Amino acid sequence: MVTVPKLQAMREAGEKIAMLTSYDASFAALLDRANVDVQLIGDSLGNVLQGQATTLPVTLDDIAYHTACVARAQPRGLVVADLPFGTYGTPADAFASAVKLMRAGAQMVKLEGGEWLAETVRFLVERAVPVCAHVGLAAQLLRDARAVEEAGAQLIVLEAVPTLVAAEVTRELSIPTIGIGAGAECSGQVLVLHDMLGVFPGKRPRFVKDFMQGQPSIFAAVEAYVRAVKDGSFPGPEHSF
Amino acid sequence: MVTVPKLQAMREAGEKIAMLTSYDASFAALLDRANVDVQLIGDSLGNVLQGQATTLPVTLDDIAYHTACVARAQPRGLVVADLPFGTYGTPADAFASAVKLMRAGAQMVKLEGGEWLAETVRFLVERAVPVCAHVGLGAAQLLRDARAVEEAGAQLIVLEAVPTLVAAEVTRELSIPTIGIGAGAECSGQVLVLHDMLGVFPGKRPRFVKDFMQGQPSIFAAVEAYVRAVKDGSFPGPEHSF
Amino acid sequence: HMVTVPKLQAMREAGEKIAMLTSYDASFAALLDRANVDVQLIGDSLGNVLQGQATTLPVTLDDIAYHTACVARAQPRGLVVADLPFGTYGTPADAFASAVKLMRAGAQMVKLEGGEWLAETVRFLVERAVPVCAHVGLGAAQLLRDARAVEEAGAQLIVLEAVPTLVAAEVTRELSIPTIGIGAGAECSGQVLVLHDMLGVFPGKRPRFVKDFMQGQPSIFAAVEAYVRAVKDGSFPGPEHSF
Amino acid sequence: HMVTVPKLQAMREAGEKIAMLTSYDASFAALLDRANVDVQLIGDSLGNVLQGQATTLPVTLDDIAYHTACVARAQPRGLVVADLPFGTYGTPADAFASAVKLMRAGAQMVKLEGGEWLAETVRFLVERAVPVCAHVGLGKTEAGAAQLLRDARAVEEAGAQLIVLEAVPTLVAAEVTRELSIPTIGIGAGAECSGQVLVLHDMLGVFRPRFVKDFMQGQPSIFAAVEAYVRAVKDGSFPGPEHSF
Amino acid sequence: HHMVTVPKLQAMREAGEKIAMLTSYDASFAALLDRANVDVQLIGDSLGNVLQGQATTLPVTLDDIAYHTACVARAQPRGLVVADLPFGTYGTPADAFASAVKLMRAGAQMVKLEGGEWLAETVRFLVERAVPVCAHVGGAAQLLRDARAVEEAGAQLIVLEAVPTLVAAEVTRELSIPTIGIGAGAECSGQVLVLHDMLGVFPGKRPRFVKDFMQGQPSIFAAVEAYVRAVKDGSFPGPEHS
Amino acid sequence: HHHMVTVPKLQAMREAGEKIAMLTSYDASFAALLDRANVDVQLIGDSLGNVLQGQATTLPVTLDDIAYHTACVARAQPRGLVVADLPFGTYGTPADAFASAVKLMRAGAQMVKLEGGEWLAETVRFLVERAVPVCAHVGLAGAAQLLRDARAVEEAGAQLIVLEAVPTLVAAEVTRELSIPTIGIGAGAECSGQVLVLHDMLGVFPGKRPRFVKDFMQGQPSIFAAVEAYVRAVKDGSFPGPEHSF
Amino acid sequence: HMVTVPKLQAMREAGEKIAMLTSYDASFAALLDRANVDVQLIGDSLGNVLQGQATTLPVTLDDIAYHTACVARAQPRGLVVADLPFGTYGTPADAFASAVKLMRAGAQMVKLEGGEWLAETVRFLVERAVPVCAHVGAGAAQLLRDARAVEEAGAQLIVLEAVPTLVAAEVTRELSIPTIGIGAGAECSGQVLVLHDMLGVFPGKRPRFVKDFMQGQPSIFAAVEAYVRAVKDGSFPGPEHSF
Amino acid sequence: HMVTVPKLQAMREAGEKIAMLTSYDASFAALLDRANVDVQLIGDSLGNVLQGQATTLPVTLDDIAYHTACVARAQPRGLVVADLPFGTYGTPADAFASAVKLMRAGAQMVKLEGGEWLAETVRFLVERAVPVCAHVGAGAAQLLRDARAVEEAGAQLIVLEAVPTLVAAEVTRELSIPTIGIGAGAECSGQVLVLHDMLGVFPGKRPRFVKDFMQGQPSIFAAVEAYVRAVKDGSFPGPEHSF
Structure with missing residues (x-):
């Protein structure tokens, strides 16, 4: 749970x-x-x-x-x-x-x-609504992140942020950070389901890896995602700027 | 188109x-x-x-x-x-x-x-709405259903959960295309629920469905395999019939 | 089930x-x-x-x-x-x-x-795939007529309410669909009661066609299981619950 | 009454x-x-x-x-x-x-x-004639207990005339009740509140959650089960130690 | 039973x-x-x-x-x-x-x-769908037809308004359901009046059909009791009110 | 207009x-x-x-x-x-x-x-600023606060005030301190006027007559004469009487 | 009254x-x-x-x-x-x-x-106690047929609009109910005009069916009185208003 | 134009x-x-x-x-x-x-x-491009305060209603914007009346402030033309229409 x-x-x-x-x-x-x-x-x-x-x-x-x-x-x-x-x-x-x-x-x-x-x-937090914050792009980004954590956000999505910059936001925050297009130095990762399943014509987004290609089932694609995230081998350098 | x-x-x-x-x-x-x-x-x-x-x-x-x-x-x-x-x-x-x-x-x-x-x-047909009918199970009544909706102007019909020989007879009697699900291979075409045929479910895989995802290199190859299998006559197989 | x-x-x-x-x-x-x-x-x-x-x-x-x-x-x-x-x-x-x-x-x-x-x-309704339960009550000849007309039309279940036991026996025998009595005695294909009556949650008279199944059961669950078993073994409704 | x-x-x-x-x-x-x-x-x-x-x-x-x-x-x-x-x-x-x-x-x-x-x-609300019942939950130094009392005093002071305490250690609930002048009503708050609340369906055994006693047990009717609850609340035998937070 | x-x-x-x-x-x-x-x-x-x-x-x-x-x-x-x-x-x-x-x-x-x-x-x-109906009608031969018609349709009560005493008497005789009259004389199964009219809460001249039952009664409740007793003992309405 | x-x-x-x-x-x-x-x-x-x-x-x-x-x-x-x-x-x-x-x-x-x-x-x-005339409505240390309530709504603009369920000597003091008219129900006779519920004073109540009300129907030939009796008793100062006063 | x-x-x-x-x-x-x-x-x-x-x-x-x-x-x-x-x-x-x-x-x-x-x-409508005014206007034949049809369905007043005087006379003779003319000549049971037309509050050119009753009168009330009178004495509409 | x-x-x-x-x-x-x-x-x-x-x-x-x-x-x-x-x-x-x-x-x-x-x-309103006309009506001291405060806030026209001629004269003189009188006398930048009143559509005694401009005129147009002329030549309102 x-x-x-x-x-x-x-x-x-x-x-x-x-x-x-x-x-x-x-x-x-x-x-x-x-x-x-x-x-x-x-x-x-x-x-x-x-x-x-x-x-x-x-x-x-x-x-x-x-x-x-x-x-x-x-x-x-x-x-x-x-x-x-x-x-x-x-x-x-x-x-x-x-x-x-x-x-x-x-x-x-x-x-x-x-x-x-x-x-x-x-x-919102005062009225018992838990909040996830969502910021993106570096001193302003760090200021943003710190203010939403201070106001009571318990999770934060970092989007399209240089890896070293992401790493520093993660080190400064006490709440978990969730990256997309932000490197492996976050507390977690998110992708759009359809992207990681390879359901898009032609140009794969640079932030994304197709977890389906070469797997025997949709379920094994998702499980692969979860394992790569947890053993720190998604995202790799190719997915990060 | x-x-x-x-x-x-x-x-x-x-x-x-x-x-x-x-x-x-x-x-x-x-x-x-x-x-x-x-x-x-x-x-x-x-x-x-x-x-x-x-x-x-x-x-x-x-x-x-x-x-x-x-x-x-x-x-x-x-x-x-x-x-x-x-x-x-x-x-x-x-x-x-x-x-x-x-x-x-x-x-x-x-x-x-x-x-x-x-x-x-x-x-509906009079008023420029094309209609797909949808009928199921016995055999005498399914057949007059089929004929009555064709006669009324339906230009496509789905046959759901029908023994292969009865569906074969309905298809022969009608002149419009028939589209089978759980109706065997003697239909003008076939339909499946997308999530069924991609295997996006453990456990109770219904009998009329094949998993076209299993062992394909991509979701696109799964769907392409369904389309080829429908056209070459080898879905649905007797396994998926009755 | x-x-x-x-x-x-x-x-x-x-x-x-x-x-x-x-x-x-x-x-x-x-x-x-x-x-x-x-x-x-x-x-x-x-x-x-x-x-x-x-x-x-x-x-x-x-x-x-x-x-x-x-x-x-x-x-x-x-x-x-x-x-x-x-x-x-x-x-x-x-x-x-x-x-x-x-x-x-x-x-x-x-x-x-x-x-x-x-x-x-x-x-x-039935033609359009809505299943229907009919519901009739009280005279006797018209009752069977009502019941037969809603069955012919397609009802798959019928409730008989406030009917002499012998009349309900007759209706049940003539119909081919199941009948469900409430204050219609025991010669029905089944029984219905309002929950709160059978649990004894009224002030005043128990209605005469109701039995309080809570009385001296150890639990609400046990009261309800007693009701189901009593319906199925035919000892509810009893003669004192019929007319 | x-x-x-x-x-x-x-x-x-x-x-x-x-x-x-x-x-x-x-x-x-x-x-x-x-x-x-x-x-x-x-x-x-x-x-x-x-x-x-x-x-x-x-x-x-x-x-x-x-x-x-x-x-x-x-x-x-x-x-x-x-x-x-x-x-x-x-x-x-x-x-x-x-x-x-x-x-x-x-x-x-x-x-x-x-x-x-x-x-x-x-x-x-109180100024516009709506009576209000508040509803709060969570050693001498402990921060939770301390914030709970601050909550309770605040709503009391703003004019709440009744307060529910849900899921609170018994000793903490006893101190909240002693500090306030309005009645406190507990659920999973021990026996030292000014009163008790339960969910009907739980107390009739139609489901125990830990805070709940089934009052239908050993009683001849639904009415006698509710009478037993009312009596138990007033004689201090509900809630029991097992019903505590 | 109450x-x-x-x-x-x-x-x-x-x-x-x-x-x-x-x-x-x-x-x-x-x-x-x-x-x-x-x-x-x-x-x-x-x-x-x-x-x-x-x-x-x-x-x-x-x-x-x-x-x-x-x-x-x-x-x-x-x-x-x-x-x-x-x-x-x-x-x-x-x-x-x-x-x-x-x-x-x-x-x-x-x-x-x-x-x-x-x-x-x-x-x-309405009657078929369990709605009880009271009809309301008010030369003498159309009135009589109208009353029979609504009665046959299933009305269980009928108000007769502004009708000659003799004509009203026929209506009541030929129908089987209770007739309630207002300005129809005393040969009806009952009477109706507007509450405020019979309590005398009107300026000046009352309608011909109405008796002020309040006048000289010790209470509003006595006025209403007077009305009920006078309808039941047959002495409202009088000839004045017809 | 002058009517x-x-x-x-x-x-x-x-x-x-x-x-x-x-x-x-x-x-x-x-x-x-x-x-x-x-x-x-x-x-x-x-x-x-x-x-x-x-x-x-x-x-x-x-x-x-x-x-x-x-x-x-x-x-x-x-x-x-x-x-x-x-x-x-x-x-x-x-x-x-x-x-x-x-x-x-x-x-x-x-x-x-x-x-x-x-x-x-x-x-x-x-409201008064925006051309809405206002009638206030107060009732029950307790007497002290009532008088503050009364003065504050008058100061604010109310041009009429109802006093409900108030000791007679208290009502008397409020009326004397305010300069707008006071209208009592259950506040004794020392108000600028009186109010009652119509159905109460016509004696249409289930049984028990409330303390503050007199039944003006009794002894009268009509409902018109009941209401006329009310208006007269208010104006000659003999409604309300001591038994009607809180 | x-x-x-x-x-x-x-x-x-x-x-x-x-x-x-x-x-x-x-x-x-x-x-x-x-x-x-x-x-x-x-x-x-x-x-x-x-x-x-x-x-x-x-x-x-x-x-x-x-x-x-x-x-x-x-x-x-x-x-x-x-x-x-x-x-x-x-x-x-x-x-x-x-x-x-x-x-x-x-x-x-x-x-x-x-x-x-x-x-x-x-x-x-008439059956449900709504009183109805009809409004109509070879063609002569259809006009009369329209008129008698709406009268026999229960209309109690009929407006006749833009109709040759002699046709309107015939229609009026054939009916029991009163006919009200606008542009229909003087052989109708009465006349209607648009208020503002007959008060002379139109732009300069007057409609053919209309007379400006206000012109030369000492008051609006006077203007309306003159219209009522002219209708009743039969000197509106005149031949310049009719066809 | x-x-x-x-x-x-x-x-x-x-x-x-x-x-x-x-x-x-x-x-x-x-x-x-x-x-x-x-x-x-x-x-x-x-x-x-x-x-x-x-x-x-x-x-x-x-x-x-x-x-x-x-x-x-x-x-x-x-x-x-x-x-x-x-x-x-x-x-x-x-x-x-x-x-x-x-x-x-x-x-x-x-x-x-x-x-x-x-x-x-x-x-x-005025900040957001809505042109505003005020409407008001010692004693005199408050009238003048109201008038100056709404002008200062941006009103570009003001109606003065039921105000004695002298006061309305002082208001008009102290404001920069045009004043429009109704029962406020002649020293205003202009006048308003209600159309139906000045056309004399209402029977018996009229409002003191009002003239019936339809009296003596051959048409409704001549009445309104007369009103417009009488305002601009300064001879409505007369002393009989003021106080």
């Missing part, structure tokens, strides 16, 4: 957290069988499920729908849901949006933004 | 039709790349996506949301969407439901039921 | 009495299923026993839908039946919209109260 | 233990009242025991209002308390809107879960 | 006991009327005039009747609670049913529909 | 020593009869929750319910001042209080009544 | 011509009634004269209801008629729902425009 | 009096514009004159928006001013939402009634 306190304990133990995006009941159950620690219903579903060029059209109802689907698989891993763009412009709106997702089964919500988010994070 | 007429010409020319369920833009693009003829946004999403015991909770908006996702991949294959349970109890209601799915990107709708559906199918 | 609409017909053929009870929430529904209740009914009796109203007429469709979803979330192996409340089946298309809502919420069959006039509605 | 908020306070002063139970429908509510249950709580526990959910987070304000109207239609003499569910009191104005809806449906008092941060919310 | 039911009013006509009915729109008066043993309390669209101060009753909506119905039912009277379907809420049988259902959910045990012969199909439709 | 009771005329009545006679009123027939009996002020109060709706308390009464009964009373076009209660829950902020008041004044209310103490000051000030 | 539907039928039989004007607000409604205008019509002409639209098609049922309630608040003794606007009577039950809305707002009668296809709708 | 806010300010500076009149529909708005009315006011007077209510409290935002769209569709050269009705400007945000609805329907400026307290609201 991965709970928010469990994530903190994993960081202190040096057990790496394997996170993956997840949008429906069948994959959620497969991911959970492969021991994925954290399943993310991310606005990435705007590209991978909805086929849009950006994630801006993704609504709060969309995220709530996919959240309810993943939740119905009753995974042992932590279910995290993104608040989509436009749904947290003020702290009271953030709270109404978070409440909707937690009613649908999310156990933590993720809000993207730097320092300015601090008051919102504090508002 | 696969059209309703091409599906008919494929039956005449003895080319089998390869259909798969599909519920999002990424698998829709992959399926299209492996030359899936028909992509079905079916109420099987109630089980496979929503994790429900049955399909009854699936609403018209659910089907419309997943249809819009598939259509946004712009596949060359035909996009068929199911009218879910409760959404076609009169012909006018059936039409309003179908219209919503076609606005979302469906090119054809599927309505499940027997003889009694004839007036509904004619109503 | 995993009870389906076809299993009820088989039970009648095999002479296994059908034990049915009302049920309105997830806790009792799990307890009933653990006690192998065959059929759970989300009935408009909830207007009286849960809502505290003098009649069942204030019960809405949304109310039945809510309780049906609660019972269904327990995932019982028994058959979940929901009542279409008063006012929600005044035409066949209305009946079908109401039934669909209840079935989306977890009902596997819906119950409509009415005599012979319902025939066309029952047929409409 | 027409139990008002001032009567509970007098109960605490007199050393008469307050017996509280959850209640969600008219039939049980009448039976609870005939058994002399002091306080009936339409709690978000209904999310688990009635709706069958893994958590109470799906419970809406309309679900609470519905069960509150059911209970109130029994016209009990005991105090009707209704929970404000999750998400319905993020600001004081929102809390007040939620509270009004529950009091329109028959609640006599509303319960809000949270610590010191709720102090303004409680003041806001 | 409740006044539709069968009980039928028994009263056979046994010759006159039925005393009064309009009622709120809980306080509902209770007082019940204590005075009023047989039937009517939430009539007369509230348009007496409560709302409108010149006609057409502004009275289904929601107004429903609100005042709930107020009367919350007194929990033993008398029967009858509610009017307001103007425009019974144009088709389906609508009539929807409207009846709303009132019965609010506390009506019977609903009143005004109209002659054309209402028969609507009456039949 | 109409206005808020300034009520203030003049206080000055002239003419006692103000107020009654609750909820429909057009009674509202016409009350006006014909020269009742000064008709109040559409939340007492309708008990007397009309049959509820145990007044909390179920909605703004829509008060607005409906206000429209009924207003369509009788009485000369007397029409005051409507803002129900429980409809004035939790000043902007909310204004939206509710607006609704009632659109329906025919000429003045709105808000129940509560000192804390209401800001809300009263917000 | 009050102008009622039977009073209008009396007027035809007695030879008193009916003076009808459109009306859309309380102030004008009060002035019209003081001038003894017999019938006030809340017509969809308001689309032109109040809304400034090029056609009357944009006028909605809510528009007609709003001005009907304005006119009704003047409490005129004249009969208050309201137009069902275009698209609100496509089926009989729609017609009834629209009419009911207009009657709750203060309408005493409703006017529906169309020929004999309307007969069934007129009958449905 | 359009009358604009800055043109009114130029009229003040040049001593040309502003003629303003209320207006609620397209026919009259066209007529008023032919008469060179400077400013057309969709005022909450419509509650009395059109809706026939005793007070203006019942007038909704939707009502004002409707009459505004009607006036605007006549496309007057004159400036269109719409009243924010009672209860639609209780906070600055709500005032802005209400104003924006009126401006979308065709209003060029909105009128808010009230004194000194409104200052903040007027600033909020």
